[PDB]
Design a protein around this ligand. Structure first.
Ligand SMILES: [Mg+2]
Ligand SMILES: [Mg+2]
Ligand SMILES: [Mg+2]
Ligand SMILES: [Mg+2]
Ligand SMILES: [Mg+2]
Length: 132
RNA sequence: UACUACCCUUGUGUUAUGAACCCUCUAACCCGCACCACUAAUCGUGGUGGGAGACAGUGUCAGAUGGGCAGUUUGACUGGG
């Protein structure tokens, strides 16, 4: 019950803090990056989509290719591996995800591109962050 | 299908805000209401009560009405016109 309470909903944890406490907030569980976007998810020009390997078709099918694709809700969220993975390796996984998602930008975006941003797991409560 | 969150439509609430509308207040404005003083003054200015009251009045802007008023128009040909 109290795993939903221990997490500091007020604070924007760093990537490192987030992946570290993701190990705790499980009571096994796949960690999950989540963006809520400023784009229009209901138009073809902004249907963000793709797939990328977690380093932590053997290069794709076996190496741990996780797919990302934004839903109609504007919420694109992707697995980045289990809580039993090393936390700096989770930082590397999120580096992969964040870099590829930011560099896959629809050029017609607005002043803000990420409305909200957070982490969860298969039993992870929300861990909101501020892109750093 | 459990459960975690990213959440999305729909409609309930708290709070902060913005408008419209009704009532209530009085402290602005007003009283060809009373009393006091200036003061011998049916003026006026103040003071004290009472009444109305953020209306009215006044200013600006706009719409309707407007011979009450004003300025003007109201052809030529043509066996007169
Ligand atoms: Mg009279
Ligand atoms: Mg006339
Ligand atoms: Mg003249
Ligand atoms: Mg004539
Ligand atoms: Mg004639």
């Amino acid at each position: 019950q109290e795993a939903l309470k221990k997490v500091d909903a007020t604070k924007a944890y760093s990537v490192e803090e987030a992946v570290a406490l993701a190990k705790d907030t499980n009571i096994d569980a796949t960690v999950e990056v989540a963006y809520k976007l400023n784009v229009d998810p209901k138009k073809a020009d902004q249907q963000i989509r793709g797939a990328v390997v977690l380093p932590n078709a053997v290069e794709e099918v076996k190496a741990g290719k996780v797919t990302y694709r934004v839903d109609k809700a504007g919420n694109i969220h992707v697995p980045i591996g289990k809580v039993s993975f090393d936390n700096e390796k989770l930082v590397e996984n999120f580096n992969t995800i964040n870099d590829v998602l930011l560099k896959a930008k629809p050029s017609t975006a607005k002043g803000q591109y990420i409305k909200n941003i957070s982490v969860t797991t298969t039993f992870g409560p929300g861990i909101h962050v501020d892109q750093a």
